[PDB]
Design a protein around this ligand. Structure first.
Ligand code: NA
Ligand code: NA
Ligand code: NA
Ligand code: NA
Ligand code: NA
Ligand code: NA
Lengths: 136, 136, 136, 135, 135, 135
């Protein structure tokens, strides 16, 4: 059988993945991105200001991991939005909509019991390395 | 590198995906389907009657998104069943078993803190566009 | 279009998947593995001793499903660690790190409201059938 | 391993087989096209007029086989031009150029000792089913 | 990019190489088979009896190369029949038909000026490793 | 279906086209290389010295086309050696061996009636872009 490419993604522009995981793994053409919190890459802790500020930082973190893999937000095909409070969905969704223009990823959003670091939002994503011919 | 196909799936037979997400995204041969609640496509709200009725509607919604992608339930390879109450697993599983006959998807099922719309069940799925040669 | 391979994975060395799901599904080159609890394959119930003992059993279960698919832990590309208590993350992570040496999977870890069987940890994984050429 | 598509291409718009071969075989996305003489599709006989008329008919036949496989001449990636007479090279090149207007295929062209039915030219091709990317 | 499988196919059931070539090369799923003369595998000499016997032996040799690559004649998608004498066309066609019983490959068949060792026929082939889909 | 890469390979390090063909076509990962005569790349004329010198130049030209496509001779999977004179077989084999040092391609080699420009040898090839796996 063919030997498929696997690339470990690492960038200093996003919180370091310490311990036995990677920021993202590209395998064949699919990139599995680890869930990102609203963590500042240089502080090792949550940015202040609550769920809206954390959502902006989380998506900035995802964007920097995508860039390191040669992609941008147009390559995302599926995402999961995990919340500490379901009532924060609308506010987080108003941040999320700023990162996508069309051909939107599949998505699930729901409230979990707790996230690491006391986070109020965590975003996971799957992307596919381009080029991609988008039909509809 | 080759340009892989990406298709955005949209059908009126399932609740519309309003905002920055799609009902499903087909990319290469893999379809990522957004989590479906027991929402009536024409009412914009949960069907009445509780978790069993919602589970039937959620799976009907998934079925209509699959059809729009040229698939049926035999193309599903992985699913996630999210519950408002773990004790509803058996009742939801008795609905779920009606949609699959053999070569069953991988699955995870667990209780979350809250789903959108006050839902009691949400189902996510991954499918692969056929033809598929099923070995075992 | 080409007919892609789908294989249903079943091994007696891991808890049987009773009902309408499979331990894992291999489709093309990607293996979707059902979430595994710290369940003893021969008892049908959780191993005693708490979250650390359950985490060891869960990962042993994943390992036996991988073996049945012709893989080992080096083929895992993404994993999810679901917890009954976020404060158990460090203890579970000290077990998890024993199964991986390098080129670590993408990962998400968080606390859910409840797992089946009263479990304190559940691990889901995605693997890709080898050979894999790991770049970095 | 996956099961790859293999399809026999057959159209009555190209000449019937005069031996144990298919007009073309599509396998995965590559189409191997049998050598075409300048035979009229309805009668199976070589068209009159010599190498120029036979070359036009052979390429017309290839075109109908490509069309049956959902392709046109832009899908051809390689071709072989077998001549009964190397002095016909310039004449056949001028015919050939009119069918392959862009993304010219790779090619080999030379004289053999004899072609079936006394043909003056026979043309083989390899195509790849689209879509293909552009420069 | 992915690393594609490339394997040299070699079997003692087919004649040893008399030059700098492999019996066949498998790359991804396509198998390019070298031109086969009607040589006996054990001795490397052309079998007696002329074009009919040489054609049978050449096709038998192709069959053993296919078998070594996990294939049979149904995996062949394209072939080339090189003749020393175009008048042998009907005789070679009748031999060839007995090996290719279904899904007939694409083909080109014609006379060249000379084959190695004075062979009267040489046959090349391209195959695709299965599984392949059916009509 | 996916859009497969198709690229015309063209380098001034190999001779300019003297007809309606590209030096090579890359499609997906397979490279079809046009027949190369022993023509000098700068002048387009056959090198003096007969079949041995022409064979070296033809293979040098193939090498430059492979290099333009990010390949070398180890990527070649199949080749065809067309001779004006079958008695040159041993001489051409000795030249050919010096370029293909490992993983020898599949091959067909025989005499045709005439080559363009009065060439004594013409060589075609098929390559697959790497990476390829090893034994
Ligand atoms: Na959503
Ligand atoms: Na809070
Ligand atoms: Na389950
Ligand atoms: Na309720
Ligand atoms: Na993690
Ligand atoms: Na507990």
């Amino acid at each position: 059988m063919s030997s498929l490419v696997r690339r470990i993604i690492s960038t200093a522009k996003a919180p370091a993945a310490i311990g036995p995981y990677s920021q993202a793994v590209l395998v064949d053409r699919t990139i599995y991105i680890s869930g990102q919190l609203g963590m500042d890459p240089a502080s090792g802790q949550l940015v202040p200001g609550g769920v809206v500020e954390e959502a902006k930082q989380a998506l900035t973190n995802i964007g920097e991991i995508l860039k390191a893999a040669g992609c941008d937000f147009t390559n995302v095909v599926a995402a999961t939005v995990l919340l500490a409070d379901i009532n924060d969905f609308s506010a987080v969704n108003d941040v999320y909509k700023q990162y996508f223009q069309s051909s939107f990823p599949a998505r699930a959003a729901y409230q979990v019991a707790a996230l690491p670091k006391g986070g109020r939002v965590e975003i996971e994503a799957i992307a596919v390395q381009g080029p991609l011919t988008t039909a509809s």
